Amino acid sequence: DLLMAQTPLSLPVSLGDQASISCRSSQSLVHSSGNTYLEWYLQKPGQSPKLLIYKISNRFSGVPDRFSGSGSGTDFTLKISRVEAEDLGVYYCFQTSHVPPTFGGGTKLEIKRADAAPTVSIFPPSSEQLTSGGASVVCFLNNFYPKDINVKWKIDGSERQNGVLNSWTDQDSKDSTYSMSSTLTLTKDEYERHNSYTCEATHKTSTSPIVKSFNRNEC
């Protein structure tokens, strides 16, 4: 029934610039009291959510004065005025003017830093994993920006799309980069029928793929 819609899903912003986040409810958040119980929470990577703003615009104790809240009726905005690295995470609006209390779906604040290309490392299956009858081929792509990246695997030249799972860390507050793992999971038997394994990373930082490769028979 009552929806809390946030835009955008993701918001890149430079340190020092102002970020603005919107929360639009489907009905008026004016409670029967005449007050409006719209709150804003931030979730830092690996942390619990924490309160920023209550009653539209009031800051919780200890919240930096750079965070501010505004709006009325159905439209609310959280502004962060001179963004710092530690401000990254997911920001959620929340309403308790009308049962049932409801959160927004969240907006990621992303720190916009200089483009950085990934450092790519490839890893054959370990001897012990093979000893157990499985085979995962692992590629790490570390310390890159922006987040968007496509990883192609090739096995003896045949592009391979099935068996490949990609996982990303949250953005690192220390350097504003992302890292990702791309894992190709095969049966030992399939793995042992092929010799050349390659993970290829296409990122806007280069025209050419960053390719890391091994031959099953080398080392």
Binding site: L51, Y54, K55, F94, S121, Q129, V138
Partner: protein, 220 residues
């Protein structure tokens, strides 16, 4: 500081019951409205339940009504959430929060994980990830640990018992076929490996396992 510590989350079969608890300290617990809020595996936040300071009034999200009961022990400063007829939608991290009336969820615990599934608890297999022969870069070597085939979440990964912190990335687990897998990477100077040991320590509290995998050069 005000503190809130959840207990009791873990793996429960569909249709089952579990009761979470939350120990409160450093504030007058019995003065305050208290709440449970959950975060789904996809990171959506859902309010679950609220209980008034005295316990007289209780409130629930529609999807949990009749199945969950929020309660509190004001003598011993504990908030509870009894859960029954558990379903897969109920899989989430459960936070207890202090609710300062209309001034917000001011304090939150770290959360306790609940997993509703028919699958069996399975400890991880931990596999080393060491570089090829010669292609070990040779000034900065990246190593890793593949943590494969465990259930339920979570696992804790450290390197050299936490001593090795810098240059570490531990990737979120992905669930497939009722088993989770994750990897962790660490980059270290050549002077430090393999001539000094690098070990990934992997803890899986659900199976009470704790495994320390040393990364050693490939036999080549």
């Amino acid at each position: 500081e005000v503190m809130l510590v959840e207990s009791g989350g873990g793996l429960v079969k569909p249709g089952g019951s579990l009761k979470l608890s939350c120990a409160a300290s450093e504030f007058t617990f019995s003065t305050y409205i208290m709440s449970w809020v959950r975060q789904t595996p996809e990171k959506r936040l859902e309010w679950v339940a609220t209980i008034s300071s005295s316990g007289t009034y209780t409130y629930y999200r529609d999807s949990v009504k009749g199945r969950f009961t929020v309660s509190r022990d004001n003598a011993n400063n504990i908030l509870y959430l009894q859960m029954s007829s558990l379903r897969s939608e109920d899989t989430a991290l459960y936070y207890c929060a202090r609710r300062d009336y209309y001034d917000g969820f001011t304090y939150w615990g770290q959360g306790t994980l609940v997993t509703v599934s028919a699958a069996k608890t399975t400890p991880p297999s931990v596999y080393p990830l060491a570089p090829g022969s010669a292609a070990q870069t040779n000034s900065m070597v990246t190593l890793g640990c593949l943590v494969k085939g465990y259930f339920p979440e979570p696992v804790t990964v450290t390197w050299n018992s936490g001593s090795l912190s810098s240059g570490v990335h531990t990737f979120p687990a992905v669930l497939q076929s009722d088993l989770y897998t994750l990897s962790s990477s660490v980059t270290v100077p050549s002077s430090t490996w393999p001539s000094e040991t690098v070990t990934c320590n992997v803890a899986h509290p659900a199976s009470s396992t704790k495994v320390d995998k040393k990364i050693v050069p490939r036999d080549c």
